[PDB]
Amino acid sequence: KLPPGWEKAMSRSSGRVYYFNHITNASQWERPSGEPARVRCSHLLVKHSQSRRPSSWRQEKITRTKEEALELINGYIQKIKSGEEDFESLASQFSDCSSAKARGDLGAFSRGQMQKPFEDASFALRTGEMSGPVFTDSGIHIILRTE
């Protein structure tokens, strides 16, 4: 039927069908379109108190809760989707990963190098697509596949 990870769902507020990807946590109204050794991704990481290392270049001690981190991620996705802010701008300013200094770019990578939920989401994205919240031991990520 649909490309890997994608399913149909019904909107509770509007009753209109939409599409959801259970690997990337992406969701959208439009029906999704139509695997490589390597993909290239950027990300925006929001850490929280249960991250494996609750510290980053932004904050020596990261104290926010998992739920507060998810709300921040949700807000950044809204601003990216509305076009009020670019992904790169938000990653440079607010990602708790040192890759913030390269607009969130992680370069190319293959399967077997990254944490599994990040890897799985990265490889299920098509070039140009963006994930919803992706949960790892580091924190919560927004992932943008660039190649």
Ligand SMILES: O=C(O)[C@@H]1Cc2ccccc2N1
């Ligand atoms: O560790 C991993 O594979 C994923 C990708 C990544 C990059 C930077 C910081 C945390 C993080 N989680």
